[PDB]
């Protein structure tokens, strides 16, 4: 009846019949079919119920209960009319296989030609989680075609299947504690457990970003600094056994501190004038654009327009839009519409910050050249009557520009960017 059988094998009969289990894993041969010499018992249909064979409460496994239905077949000929039958049960769960012989005695009262006698039940063929098992049934002599039955077995993903089976709980348990001012990896395994532990940074394309690997003998508590936290920091655990199941967990995906540290570790690097790279532990969606830094310090004004915020992908080469590099040109990086990076990539190569004014010419209709100077207090159209450095020098800068004393940084059908040195006027 029960979903729980003991550790010993046992047979079960429908009322009236008598079944004796004769298995010690016999040498079962279906053999050839023989003409029946009168009424024979015949296996009609196999039915398999999944069951749990427990040798103790901790040690439990999936077991397969098989019920074999029998009917009176063979030739019709008009203790006396009792019918004997010896029923083989063949089980094949690749790689292993086992054979079970059962013997049924059906009393005369149950012997009605054509109709059933009932069933014989077998507890049970033990098989591995997720295995595909095949069963065959037949009598010996064989009077008909063998019955066949194929079952796919459940994975640890089943209810009962979890708490009682060790192949489901004896897995490397992981818990996290960010309360001890540091980050703790609580590894709940048995004292005797040998296991592989790997801390990795889960990147999009070509995910391996190795950080740590340790063959251990648990249980252990691996302590990390809250400065080592990144959103793509994932843990991989597995017992050091061939084909053991690996458990992966990414618990920092939306952690505030992780994202905080992610940008602290992010760096912009120059490969060549027209090649730059974003280096970050994790790959978050971001937008990047060129910025103009003044020699007065950090107040860096982005050049949108005429330029645009383009999507930046971590560990992918970014080809600069402009024709000429400038020490005052910095690359700005924003994610979730918040500024995260501002590396002035031409400060070491072409540096330091030059005292140059940036002019934004815009060709109007009739190809009219309209000049504007990028100043701390916005863009001022030249020449102007403003009490600002570039407006005061407007007429001199306009002469510099058209006399070709200014460096062209960017050219387009709609406009141009110009770097005009002020050094001749400020000193």
């Amino acid at each position: 009846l029960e979903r729980l059988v003991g550790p010993q094998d046992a047979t079960h009969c429908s009322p009236g019949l008598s079944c004796r289990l004769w298995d010690s894993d016999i040498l079962c041969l279906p053999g050839d079919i023989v003409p029946a010499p009168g009424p024979v018992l015949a296996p009609t249909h196999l039915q398999t119920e999944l069951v749990l064979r427990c040798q103790k409460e901790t040690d439990c496994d999936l077991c397969l209960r098989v019920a074999v239905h029998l009917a009176v077949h063979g030739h019709w000929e008009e203790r006396n009319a009792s019918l004997q039958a010896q029923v083989v049960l063949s089980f094949q769960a690749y790689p292993t296989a086992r054979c079970v012989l059962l013997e049924v005695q059906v009393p005369a009262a149950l012997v009605q030609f054509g109709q059933s006698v009932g069933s014989v039940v077998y507890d049970c063929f033990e098989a591995a989680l997720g295995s595909e098992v095949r069963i065959w049934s037949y009598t010996q002599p064989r009077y008909e075609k063998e019955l066949q039955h194929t079952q796919q077995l459940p994975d640890c993903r089943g209810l009962e299947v979890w708490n009682s089976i060790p192949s489901c709980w004896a897995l490397p348990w992981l818990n996290v504690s960010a309360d001890g001012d540091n980050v703790h990896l609580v590894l709940q395994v048995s004292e005797e457990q040998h296991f592989g532990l790997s801390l990795y940074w889960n990147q999009v394309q070509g995910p391996p970003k190795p950080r740590w690997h340790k063959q251990l003998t648990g249980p252990q508590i691996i302590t990390l600094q809250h400065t080592d936290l990144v959103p793509c920091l994932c843990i991989q655990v597995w017992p050091l056994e061939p084909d053991s199941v690996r458990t992966n967990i990414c618990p920092f995906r939306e952690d505030p501190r992780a994202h905080q540290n992610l940008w602290q570790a992010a760096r912009l690097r120059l490969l060549t004038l027209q090649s730059w790279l974003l280096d970050a532990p994790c790959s978050l969606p971001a937008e990047a654009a060129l910025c103009w830094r003044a020699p007065g310090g950090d107040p860096c004004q982005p050049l949108v327009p005429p330029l645009s915020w383009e999507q930046v992908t971590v560990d992918k080469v970014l080809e600069f839009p402009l024709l000429k590099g400038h020490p005052n040109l910095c690359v700005q990086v924003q994610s979730s519409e918040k500024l995260q990076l501002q590396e002035c990539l031409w400060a070491d190569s072409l540096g330091p910050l030059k005292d140059d004014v940036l002019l934004l010419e815009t060709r109007g209709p009739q190809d009219q050249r309209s000049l504007c100077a990028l100043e701390p207090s916005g863009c001022t159209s030249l020449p102007s009557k403003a009490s600002t450095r570039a407006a005061r020098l407007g007429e001199y800068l306009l002469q510099d520009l058209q006399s070709g004393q200014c460096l062209q940084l960017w050219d387009d059908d709609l406009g141009a960017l110009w770097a005009c040195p002020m050094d001749k006027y400020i000193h």
């Binding site: 010690s24 041969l29 053999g31 050839d32 054979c99 061939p242």
Partner: protein, 104 residues
Amino acid sequence: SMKLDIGIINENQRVSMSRNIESRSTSPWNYTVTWDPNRYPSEVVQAQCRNLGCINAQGKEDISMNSVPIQQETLVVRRKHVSFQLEKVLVTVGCTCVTPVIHH
């Protein structure tokens, strides 16, 4: 010729835990059930390497490597007339990925 028992000694070993190995392998294989009712075991499962080369990280066939079958000579019991006879059957169990023998 001597007598043989119907009982089969089973050591009940459990190293059999690995799953869907034939499909997860870089030298994947397919199975073929062979059947004979006068043979013990009646079903002898034969593996066949799915490809000549091995499967690369991109999931495509790689000609520079070879899927090679792993064969084992095994005993089956055959019924005669009535008597029993042992018979050797060559079984491909699975496949492995090998670097080819490139003679120059």
